[PDB]
Amino acid sequence: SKWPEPVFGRLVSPGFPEKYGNHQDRSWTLTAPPGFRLRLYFTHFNLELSYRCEYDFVKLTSGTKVLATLCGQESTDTERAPGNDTFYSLGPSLKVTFHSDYSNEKPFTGFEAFYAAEDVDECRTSLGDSVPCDHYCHNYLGGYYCSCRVGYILHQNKHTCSALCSGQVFTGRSGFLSSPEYPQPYPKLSSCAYNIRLEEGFSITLDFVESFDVEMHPEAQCPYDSLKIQTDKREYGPFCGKTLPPRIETDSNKVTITFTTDESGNHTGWKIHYTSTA
Amino acid sequence: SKWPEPVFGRLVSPGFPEKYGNHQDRSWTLTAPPGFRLRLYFTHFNLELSYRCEYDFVKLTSGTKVLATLCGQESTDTERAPGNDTFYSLGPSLKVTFHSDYSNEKPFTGFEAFYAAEDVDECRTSLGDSVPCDHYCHNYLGGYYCSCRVGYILHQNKHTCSALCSGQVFTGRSGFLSSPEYPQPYPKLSSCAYNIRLEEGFSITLDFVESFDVEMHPEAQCPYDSLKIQTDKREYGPFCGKTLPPRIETDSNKVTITFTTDESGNHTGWKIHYTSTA
Ligand SMILES: [Ca+2]
Ligand SMILES: [Ca+2]
Ligand SMILES: [Ca+2]
Ligand SMILES: [Ca+2]
Ligand SMILES: [Ca+2]
Ligand SMILES: [Ca+2]
């Protein structure tokens, strides 16, 4: 219900299209709305040529960086003329500076430049392996939004996808149980809780199977990702490393398994096969 | 004691407090002794600001985790400056990494950081984790040690408190007898021994009376906690499970009850009322 305002304009050297004079200094600060960057190009460029544009120049800077230093008419080995190149602001702001020195041996016409704001694509551009979203990144005008696959919920940090893996209440007495996505990497910032609740007088036995991969610390044990098992009379765990933990035999009919994950890592996780006797 | 690295120290960007240069890379690995962690903070911080600190940064890592990525002077929406924040190592080690890219358009002054070792308090958990001691936990500089309540003795594992429940010699003809702390959970790694010595020609009768709770096995009987009874003419037990066992009638004037517990469990235990006839 609220939309960005357009931002666009035209910049010229003093007196354009007539020849620019000596000892002139101009600067324009251009600012796009949040989520936008600026796009600038030159329809006309004809300045005094000099080594590294020491005499006359047009300087484009953005944020903390110098985007370009331009002079002459056609780009050389150590100088740059803009040609049909396009220049982009870093962030929403862009400064344009024009300077002429004490003399022009020829009648130089200066420059005509045009600029326009365009939406930043936070999902595709400024992207290496670093996607700002855990699952789905949605670009829109002036921003972006994150969403998650089914069976997840967006964390409060608005980027991480937390599994909905609590609430599983098993009553079938022989069965399997697992970390999310296994054997794919288990999700970040998740709190899983699995409850085996069956008839009284029965005793359960739990078995880890196949592969095991939980984030470990060099000299500490399991401070990051914590996998623990709980009978109403006793506690077991936490299990880490990359070796399948030994069998466990419970006295109780009701058992609770909890799996907690922290903000980082791509570890595969765990399987558990539980059986039964009297 | 003595350690190769000092209890306190100072790290600065190359050339501090003068402007740092381009294409610079530094890394310091700081390591405290076991039982200590490292605490690091910044007295001065002024780096080039960039989206996600891609240009210049200080990265604090510990173990496998990145504690922080820092740039700028004051923290923004997607960037972090340390301010007066304190950073803590996970375990005794902590790595500091400094990097600068190809240019500095302003005189960025870099950073001054200080670190100090501090004792880990193994006794004071956030207590979402377990307590390392059975009874009393004592913290000291560089370590901790355990102790027990009166009537107990510290087990060889230096953490578990074993009850002193041997030595009870009953001569009274009618009476009660019990697992330690009943009806509170009976202690771990304890070996209790109760001796009933009565006049010749008399016969004792034993009765479980209130609650009965001893660690049971799925398909076996009593391999963890073992409660056994011994007359000079017979042996009874071991008794486990969680149902009050039937009455027992001894021929002997002499009875010895032995109760053994394992390293884990919170089971309540047992009472026994014994009487006598001719
Ligand atoms: Ca000139
Ligand atoms: Ca956008
Ligand atoms: Ca993790
Ligand atoms: Ca830099
Ligand atoms: Ca300590
Ligand atoms: Ca026990």
Author numbering:
A (entry chain A), B (entry chain D): 1 to 278
Paper text:
The lectin pathway of complement is activated by complexes comprising a recognition component (mannose-binding lectin, serum ficolins, collectin-LK or collectin-K1) and a serine protease (MASP-1 or MASP-2). MASP-1 activates MASP-2, and MASP-2 cleaves C4 and C4b-bound C2. MASPs are homodimers that circulate as zymogens bound to the collagenous domains of MBL. Each MASP comprises two N-terminal CUB (C1r/C1s, Uegf, and bone morphogenetic protein-1) domains separated by an epidermal growth factor (EGF)-like domain followed by two short complement regulator (SCR) domains and a C-terminal serine protease (SP) domain.
In particular, MASP-2 CUB1-EGF-CUB2 (subsequently called MASP-2 3D) was crystallized in the presence of citrate that chelates Ca2+, and although Ca2+ was bound to the EGF-like domain, the CUB1 and CUB2 domains lacked Ca2+ and became partially disordered as a result (Feinberg et al., 2003). Because there was no structure of rat MASP-1 3D, and the existing structure of rat MASP-2 3D lacked two of the three Ca2+, including those Ca2+ that form part of the binding site for MBL, both rat MASP-1 3D and MASP-2 3D were crystallized in the presence of 2 mM calcium and diffraction data were collected. This resulted in one MASP-1 structure at 3.7 Å resolution and three independent MASP-2 structures at 2.6–2.7 Å resolution. For MASP-2 3D, 279 of 280 residues were visible. Interestingly, the three structures overlaid closely, with RMSDs of 0.682, 0.871, and 0.992 Å over 276 Cα atoms. The only notable differences were in the N-terminal seven residues and in a loop within the EGF-like domain (Thr125–Ser130), probably reflecting flexibility. A major difference, however, was that the structures now contained three bound Ca2+ compared with the single Ca2+ in the EGF-like domain of the earlier MASP-2 3D structure. In the MASP-2 CUB1 domain, Ca2+ formed contacts with six oxygen atoms in the side chains of Glu48, Asp56, Asp101, and Asn104 and the main chain oxygen of Ser103 (distances between 2.3 and 2.7 Å). In the MASP-2 CUB2 domain, Ca2+ formed contacts with five oxygen atoms at the side chains of Glu215, Asp225, Asp262, and Ser264. The firm identification in this study of the three Ca2+ sites in rat MASP-2 now resolves a key ambiguity of the earlier rat MASP-2 structure (Feinberg et al., 2003).
